[PDB]
Structure formats: C-alpha cells, structure tokens
C-alpha cells in the first residue's frame, strides 16, 4: 500500500504504537547492545511501547551453570523499559533450545535420558522438576513487580502434533509443563500473565494439539492465561483466514493472544535468499506491504482478542532471519532464488532478509505506510 509515500527517516514518522494504542501494544525484540546505540534507542522510544529480549532471558543465558545467575543483561532491558513506560515480556522460562545441559544430568553426572531403572528414572524426574522450580522461582522472585507477561513454556508441541520429545518430556513427562506454570503463578502472584508460546500455531495438526493440551491443562487447574504466537511467517503463508481461525479458536477457551515474534520473510521455506539487501527487487517490498496491510487489518478486526503485537526486531539491519537466509548458486556462480531451479552449491545463512516495516537505514518501508494508515 501507497508506494507514493516517501522513504523518510523513521525518527520523523508517525509513531507506530500511538496508531495502535487502543487495539494492542506494539513491541520489539532486542539485544542489550541496541540500548547503547543511538538510532535503536530512538526507534524504541518513538515507536514501541512493549519490549522483549531476543536472547538474554533464555535459560542458558540466565543460569548457564547451576547456581550461577546472570541477570545483568536482562536487568538492562528491564531498566530501559521502566524508564520509557514499556511493557515487558519474559522470553522464556522453559525451552528445549538454548538450555544448559546441567539440567539433564543425574547425580553421578550421566545423562538422565540414558537411565533404564524406573526407580532411578523417577528420582531423576523429581530432581529435574526441583531444578526447574528453582530456576523459575529465582527469576520470577526478581522480576514479578516489573514484568507483566511471561512465556512460561515454548515449543512444547511438535510439528507432528505430538508433545515434543525433548529431554524435558523424556525425563519428566507432561508434568514439567504443569510445574512450570504452577511455579510461575506461585512465586509471581495473580497479577502476572502466563503464556504458552509456539510457532506455526496456525498449522494442523499442531494447532489442535496445542488447543487440546491447553484445554486439558486448564481443566486440571494449571494457570494458563494466553497463547504466544511467534508468527514467523511469509508473504503468502499462512493465509489471513487461517490466522483468524487460529486466534478465534484459542480465544474461545478464554485465552489472551499475543503475537510475540512477528516477521514477514521475503522468502519461502527452505529460503533461497538474495545475497544482499540491495539485490532484493522493489516488487518484493510492494508484495510485503500488501501482506502487512491485510495482516494488521486482521489484527485490528480481532483487537478484542489480541493484547500485543511484537516484531522480532527493530529495523531490517538486524534480524535472526539472516541466519536462515541461505544463498543458492548455479554452476556459473549466479544466484538462484527460484525454489525449484537447478543449483550447484549453497552458502548457508550468508544472505539477507527484509522482514520489518523499517529499512536497514532506519527509513520507513512501503509496509510502514501500509500499516500506519486507516485503510
């Protein structure tokens, strides 16, 4: 929408959070170094009223060794948010990635998953659950008065619609999920809000498996307040109709919905990326703008069911999507972006994606104009 509109500095553009302030908060995922960068700081002050850490609140960053807690980086994000009136989300208490391996070792230092004795397996389950509770207790006791929204567990349902068979699940079963939520509620009180977080929440059979899991846990009294939808999506997929059905489905259980990691990749999956930002054709940015136009129109339609929409980054100069931006080369060394075309080699994670409404020079993209207007 409206490529007529100019590529002005985002520091001079109408504020994104103020455009949506009655519908939902507008968030950005950050690294602490960006709080020391003048442009990123001004971007956060101008456009965003919610914040989340893309990495430094993950388990391995918080307690990389048992009893060694590193809150210095998380503290910096919390302090910045409080100074600028931003909501904070905690990402994430429990996850099968970026998770220190000391969690899953028995008292003799061996992997708990290897244990065959059922009496010892049960001892390992209780030990793991105690470590889990202490990790959550220490974090929530420090942050309960500052951080309102909590991703308690992340990606606990596999894409095959079964519970993901992580060490958490192999060792403790489903109880690691119940213990995580119960611990957060106990040490954090009734005022913090507890989410189950996942990607591809729109996609069956994962969607209904997540639905069934949360419905059953709440029937058993496990405190779950909402669903965190990562929304790492594409220009075409998933369809707005399927996003809408997903949001409505979870809202019917009385759950809040938060969009916690929104980015609109320029590519399919697996991605065949352009090697640089400059190689991306203008038309892709128009396609992305029209997708963003439909997407935020749908979010507004559903604003009574969505409290927050967070982008997984600030501007196109920095996005975890670049780690997936594989560049394919044919035999003559030219770039291949057609998903079915011949190619000879791939350079994994060497290309550039362009997923946000702000460009890498901090000027607004057509996608920005598409979502700042009221059409």
Instruction: List contacts with Zn ion (CB under 5 A).
Output: 17, 22, 49, 293, 373
Question: Under the criterion CB under 5 A, does residue 304 sit at the interface with Cl ion?
Answer: no
> Which of 350, 343, 370 has the alpha carbon at shortest distance from 279?
350
Choose one: 17-25, 212-220, 238-246, 276-284; the region binding Cl ion (CB under 5 A): 17-25
For residue 68, the cross-strand partners are 65
Q: How far apart are CA 162 and CA 171, in angstroms?
A: 16
Q: Which is nearer to Cl ion, 36 or 165 (CB)?
A: 36
Q: Which is nearer to Cl ion, 75 or 300 (CB)?
A: 300
Q: How far apart are CA 145 and CA 162, in angstroms?
A: 35
> Which of 320, 256, 323 has the alpha carbon at shortest distance from 89?
256
Q: Which is nearer to Zn ion, 49 or 166 (CB)?
A: 49
Q: Which is nearer to Cl ion, 223 or 355 (CB)?
A: 355
Question: Under the criterion CB under 5 A, does residue 22 sit at the interface with Cl ion?
Answer: yes
Cβ neighbours for 201, distance < 8 A, ≥ 6 positions apart: 207, 210, 227, 229, 230, 246, 250
Q: How far apart are CA 340 and CA 248, in angstroms?
A: 35
* CB of 185 closer than 8 Å to CB of 173: no
Q: Which is nearer to Zn ion, 293 or 316 (CB)?
A: 293
Minimum gap (Å) between residue 320 Cβ and Cl ion: 4
Q: Which is nearer to Cl ion, 177 or 357 (CB)?
A: 357
For residue 257, the cross-strand partners are 227, 306
Minimum gap (Å) between residue 245 Cβ and Zn ion: 22
**Binding track, positions 316-335, relative to Cl ion; x by CB under 5 A:** ----x---------------
Minimum gap (Å) between residue 54 Cβ and Cl ion: 6
Backbone angles phi, psi at 140, to 5 degrees: -70, -35
CB atoms under 10 Å from CB of 6, counted, come to 10
Minimum gap (Å) between residue 115 Cβ and Zn ion: 29
Choose one: 20-28, 124-132, 187-195, 241-249; the region binding Cl ion (CB under 5 A): 20-28
Q: How far apart are CA 241 and CA 198, in angstroms?
A: 19
Minimum gap (Å) between residue 111 Cβ and Zn ion: 24
Q: Which is nearer to Cl ion, 22 or 334 (CB)?
A: 22
CB atoms under 10 Å from CB of 152, counted, come to 30
The two three-digit tokens of residue 285, written as one number: 């940015």
Residues binding Cl ion: what is the number (CB under 5 A)? 2
Minimum gap (Å) between residue 319 Cβ and Cl ion: 6
- Pick what 340 binds: Zn ion, Cl ion, none; C-beta below 5 to 8 Å, kind-dependent: none
CB atoms under 10 Å from CB of 324, counted, come to 18
CA distances from 182 to 108, 166, 261, 301 (A): 29, 20, 25, 33
Choose one: 16-24, 80-88, 232-240, 348-356; the region binding Cl ion (CB under 5 A): 16-24
> Which residue sits closest to Cl ion, CB atoms considered?
320
Minimum gap (Å) between residue 253 Cβ and Cl ion: 27
- Pick what 159 binds: Zn ion, Cl ion, none; C-beta below 5 to 8 Å, kind-dependent: none
Q: Which is nearer to Zn ion, 211 or 299 (CB)?
A: 299
Choose one: 14-22, 179-187, 204-212, 350-358; the region binding Cl ion (CB under 5 A): 14-22
Q: How far apart are CA 117 and CA 115, in angstroms?
A: 6
Minimum gap (Å) between residue 125 Cβ and Cl ion: 34
Question: Under the criterion CB under 5 A, does residue 283 sit at the interface with Cl ion?
Answer: no
Backbone angles phi, psi at 179, to 5 degrees: -60, -40
177 alpha-carbon distance from chain centroid: 18
Minimum gap (Å) between residue 221 Cβ and Zn ion: 26
Cβ neighbours for 365, distance < 8 A, ≥ 6 positions apart: 7, 285, 288, 289, 316, 354, 356, 357, 358, 359
Binding site for Cl ion (CB under 5 A): 22, 320
């Amino acid at each position: 929408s409206y490529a007529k509109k100019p590529h002005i500095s985002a520091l001079n553009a109408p504020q994104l959070d103020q455009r949506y302030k009655n519908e939902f908060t507008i968030g950005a995922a950050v690294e602490p170094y960006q709080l020391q960068n003048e442009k990123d700081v001004q971007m956060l002050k101008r456009h965003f009223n919610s914040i989340v850490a893309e990495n430094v609140m993950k388990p391995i960053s918080i307690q990389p060794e048992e009893g060694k807690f590193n809150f210095e980086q998380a503290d910096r994000i919390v302090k910045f948010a409080k100074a600028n009136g931003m909501d904070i989300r905690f990402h994430t208490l429990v996850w099968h990635s970026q998770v220190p391996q000391w969690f899953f070792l028995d008292k003799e230092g061996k992997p708990m998953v290897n244990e065959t004795d059922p009496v010892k397996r049960e001892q390992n389950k209780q030990l793991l659950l105690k470590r889990l509770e202490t990790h959550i207790k220490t974090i929530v006791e420090r942050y309960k008065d500052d951080i309102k929204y909590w991703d308690v567990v992340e990606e606990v349902v596999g894409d095959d619609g079964k519970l993901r068979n992580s060490p958490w699940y192999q060792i403790a079963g489903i109880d690691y999920i119940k213990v995580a939520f119960q611990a957060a509620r106990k040490y954090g009180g009734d005022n913090i809000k507890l989410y189950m977080n996942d990607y591809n929440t729109e996609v069956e059979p994962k969607r209904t498996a997540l639905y069934n899991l949360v419905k059953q846990l709440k029937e058993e009294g496990v405190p779950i307040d909402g669903i965190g939808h990562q929304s790492h999506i594409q220009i075409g997929w998933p369809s707005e109709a399927e996003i809408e059905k997903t949001i409505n489905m979870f809202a019917a259980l009385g759950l809040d919905n938060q969009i916690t990691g929104l980015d609109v990749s320029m590519y399919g999956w697996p991605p065949r990326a352009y090697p640089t930002y400059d190689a991306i054709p203008k038309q892709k940015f128009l396609d992305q703008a029209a997708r963003y136009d439909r997407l935020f129109k749908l979010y507004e339609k559903l604003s009574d069911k969505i409290s927050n929409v967070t982008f997984w980054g600030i501007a196109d100069n920095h996005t975890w999507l670049d780690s997936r931006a594989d560049v394919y080369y044919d035999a003559n060394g030219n770039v291949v972006v057609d998903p079915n075309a011949p190619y000879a080699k791939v350079e994994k994670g060497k290309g550039k994606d362009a997923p946000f409404v702000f460009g890498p020079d901090y000027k607004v993209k057509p996608a920005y104009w598409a979502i700042i207007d009221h059409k």
